[PDB]
């Protein structure tokens, strides 16, 4: 478990910056889906990147 | 709210808003690279009819996904629930991604299944994807 | 290989890798701000014993989180499953973050619960968190 990411994720979602919070349904699913296909990472890492993707747009 | 997950049950206050995401990575196979299957929830629908909710989802996807291309719209049914199936593609860092997204009307939130692959690899993973969605039973 | 989620049942091939993350945003309450409650899985443990697995988690958290330092640790049993509870503190961009994390031994993957808040706000979110964990019933 990446404590780095669990902390980042838990922090981001607390402040309203989770993926499902900032973009529509279809988009959040699509962003999460791309992150997983793009490293030895896990679900946490994927959800974080989906939010960084969503934020840069 | 008693909340069930694959590995346990636990009670959740109703003031907690759910953003849970099930994620399955389809392993690489032969010529095809790895794909992803994701279950997400969306509680945005409010009072609009379902058919118009999907439209709001389409308009948002065309606006925010770069290189959006719609391939198919399917107004179908899943075990008594109105459903819409979306085949579209968008571009991520020069790579063409082929998406297959299902919106299943439910309260308090729409269930969304999203398969991400490449147009070339889609036919390879369509069997496994077809397997899962035909097995989906929304729970009361 | 049937997969159970709060809203449906479905068959998932075993070749697919589970990376699911349950996510809840805790509402602000009194002087305290919103918190998050996350359930993640980990298959890295392998054959190493829980204690040495839990051991390795702190070693990595202690080098990777700026300003790490450990407040508490429990060793408890949840319905026959060994569990360790950690209260530790770290700073992200100069603001104090507090984590309450429980590792529940299980296979094929260890269950992990993570509550994020601030040292100040932990007492205000603790009652609801206590509700959630006193009800967690693992499946056999």
- Mutating which of C17, C18, C23 best tests the A interface, going by the most A Cβ atoms within 10 A? C23
Question: How many Cβ atoms sit within 10 Å of the Cβ of residue C17?
Answer: 17
Q: Which residues of C touch A37 (CB under 8 A)?
A: none
Q: Which domain holds residue A30?
A: 3-55
Question: Among C39, C20, A55, C43, which residue's Cα sits nearest to residue B38?
Answer: C20
Query: Residue C19 and residue A43: Cβ atoms within 8 Å?
Result: yes
Query: Residue A14 and residue C99: Cβ atoms within 8 Å?
Result: no
**PDB resolution in Å:** 2.6
Check CB contact of B38 with chain A, cutoff 8 Å.
yes
Query: Residue C135 and residue B10: Cβ atoms within 8 Å?
Result: yes
How far apart are the C-alpha atoms of B96 and B99, rounded to whole Å? 10
**Domain count within chain A:** 1
Experimental approach: X-ray
> Closest-CA residue in chain A for B117?
A37
Give the tokens for residue C104: 């529940």
Query: Residue B23 and residue A29: Cβ atoms within 8 Å?
Result: no
3-state secondary structure chain C: CEEEECCEEEECCCCCEECCEEEEEECCECCECCEEEEEEEECCCCCCCHHHHHHHHHHHHHHHCCCCEEEEEEEEEECCEEEEEEEEEEEECCEEEEEEEEEECCCCCEEEEEEEECCCCHHHHHHHHHHHHHCCEECC
Going across the sheet that includes C8-11, the strands are B137-138, C8-11, C2-5
CB pairs under 8 A between A and B: 91
Q: Which residues of C touch A34 (CB under 8 A)?
A: none
Q: Which domain holds residue B117?
A: 1-140
Identify the sign of the CA torsion A52, C88, C59, C48.
negative
- Mutating which of B21, B24, B140 best tests the C interface, going by the most C Cβ atoms within 10 A? B24
**Domain count within chain B:** 1
Give me the residue from C19, C64, C92 closest to A42, CB to CB. C19
CB C121 within 8 A of CB C97: no
Strands (E), chain B: 2-5, 8-11, 17-18, 22-26, 35-42, 69-78, 81-92, 95-104, 110-117, 137-138
Give the tokens for residue C16: 């697919």
Give the tokens for residue C81: 């499953």
The C-alpha angle with vertex B12 and arms to B6 and B13, in degrees rounded to 5, equals 165
Check CB contact of A21 with chain B, cutoff 8 Å.
yes
Query: Residue C42 and residue A14: Cβ atoms within 8 Å?
Result: no
């Amino acid at each position: 478990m990446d404590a780095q990411a669990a902390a980042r994720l838990g922090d981001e979602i607390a402040h309203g910056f989770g993926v499902a919070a900032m973009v529509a349904g279809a988009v959040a699913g699509a962003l999460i889906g791309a992150a997983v296909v793009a490293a030895a990472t896990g679900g946490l890492a994927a959800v974080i990147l989906a939010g960084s993707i969503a934020a840069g747009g | 709210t008693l909340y069930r997950l694959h590995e346990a049950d636990l009670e959740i206050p109703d003031a907690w808003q759910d953003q849970s995401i099930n994620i399955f990575k389809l392993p690489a196979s032969g010529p095809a690279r790895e794909a992803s299957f994701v279950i997400s929830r969306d509680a945005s629908q409010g009072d609009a009819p379902f058919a118009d909710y999907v439209a709001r989802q389409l308009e948002n996807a065309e606006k925010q996904l770069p290189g959006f291309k719609l391939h198919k719209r399917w107004d179908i049914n899943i075990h008594g629930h109105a459903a819409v199936l979306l085949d579209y593609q968008w571009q991520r860092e020069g790579r063409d991604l082929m998406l297959r997204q299902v919106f299943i009307e439910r309260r308090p939130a729409v269930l969304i299944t999203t398969l991400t692959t490449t147009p070339a690899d889609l036919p390879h993973h369509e069997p496994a994807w077809k397997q899962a969605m035909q097995t989906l039973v929304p729970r009361p």
